Design a protein around this ligand. Structure first.
Ligand SMILES: O=P([O-])(O)O
Ligand SMILES: O=P([O-])(O)O
Ligand SMILES: [K+]
Length: 256
């Protein structure tokens, strides 16, 4: 029965889980997947510490940053910057306080109002970079260990951040109802989250396994905004579909 063990993890099937209540979002026509995937990883980390499934304001992160003005719609950033933004501001408003519209990416950072809730209240970034990252290509000859690392973090933190090449999921007949059997590229350009996994039997009757991946292209794309992808992919791939994974090292007290 249980919804997240070492062989099978799918919290989406449990309407009672905090994580299942974090609805899929749409980044729109800006390069802001770095914000969606990073804030979702924090949102699941919060769920695991007993907090409400309250959405972080992606627009606040897009619009509030130190230094010279940047083109926050045309230029993607990284999860390292999500953390840099937290550490500079110490405030993450709820989505409801400052809701996302992609055409507003670029607006002046809004003044925090008294009635805004702080979704990072009492949060600490652990020492020494604040995150841990892994490259699939560095595990080409111990893919098992890579899989194990990701499974453990999905179990414990509720998700990891993963980087993929967006083109790899733009196959002309991409169907969210199928486990995709995909290759990756030498590089990546789009942040997603791995949120679960399980085993399946493929079209050749072979035992295989899949990641469940959350995207930020709205709930119409894929399978209600998610898709399944084979952990290994075609034998011939030089590069795994999952290029990199990033995990945040955050200390949040058990509360709310
Ligand atoms: O968020 P993206 O469009 O820079 O992959
Ligand atoms: O498409 P490849 O570069 O993963 O073989
Ligand atoms: K490729």
């Amino acid at each position: 029965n249980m919804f997240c063990n070492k062989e099978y993890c799918n919290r989406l099937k449990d309407e009672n889980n905090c994580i299942s209540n974090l609805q899929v979002e749409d980044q729109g026509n800006c390069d802001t997947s770095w914000i969606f995937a990073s804030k979702y990883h924090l949102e699941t980390i919060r769920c695991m510490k007993g907090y409400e499934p309250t959405k972080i304001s992606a627009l606040y992160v897009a619009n509030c940053y130190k230094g010279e003005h940047k083109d926050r719609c045309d230029e993607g950033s990284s999860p390292m910057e999500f953390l840099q933004i937290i550490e500079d501001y110490g405030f993450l408003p709820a989505e409801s306080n400052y809701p996302y519209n992609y055409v507003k990416v670029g607006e002046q950072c809004p003044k925090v109002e008294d009635h805004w809730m702080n979704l990072w209240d009492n949060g600490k970034i652990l020492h020494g970079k604040g995150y841990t990252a892994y490259e699939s290509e560095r595990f080409h000859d111990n893919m098992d260990a890579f899989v194990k690392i990701i499974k453990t973090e999905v179990m414990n933190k509720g998700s990891v951040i993963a980087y993929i090449k967006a083109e790899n999921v733009m196959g002309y007949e991409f169907s969210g109802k199928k486990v995709q059997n995909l290759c990756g590229d030498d590089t990546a350009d789009h942040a997603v989250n791995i949120v679960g996994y399980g085993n399946y039997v493929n079209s050749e009757g072979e035992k295989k396994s899949y990641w469940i991946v959350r995207n930020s292209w709205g709930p119409y794309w894929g399978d209600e905004g998610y898709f399944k992808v084979d952990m290994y992919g075609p034998t011939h791939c030089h590069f795994n579909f999952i290029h990199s994974v990033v995990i945040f090292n955050v200390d949040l007290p058990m509360n709310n």
